[PDB]
């Protein structure tokens, strides 16, 4: 998926790297095997024309 990783908290047991927010998109914290990295949705820019 498109994920932006930023420094975050220690939330989660860490037994499973995969995490869900009750929706198909995944928080994906603990992306690194030992390090904690939380991914974010791809940046999208609104475009309009007059």
């Amino acid at each position: 998926g498109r994920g932006v990783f930023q420094n975050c908290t220690a939330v989660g047991v860490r037994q499973q790297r995969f995490v869900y927010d009750a929706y198909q998109n995944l928080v994906g914290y603990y992306s690194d095997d030992g390090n904690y990295y939380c991914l974010r949705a791809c940046v999208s820019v609104p475009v309009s024309v007059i």
Partner: protein
């Protein structure tokens, strides 16, 4: 197949005495959802504060 150790050479199995009344005891421990008794974490994914 795997054999951990040699079969026992004892001539006869040890004598066993069975008494149901002595073993029987009255103790009550009902399951509590608030205490999360006997609850298994989902193996598929970790979950956040939500």
């Amino acid at each position: 197949y795997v054999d951990v150790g040699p079969d026992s050479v004892k001539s006869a199995c040890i004598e066993v005495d069975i008494q149901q009344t002595f073993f029987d005891k009255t103790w009550p421990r009902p399951i509590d959802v608030s205490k999360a008794d006997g609850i298994i974490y989902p193996q598929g994914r970790t979950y956040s504060n939500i």
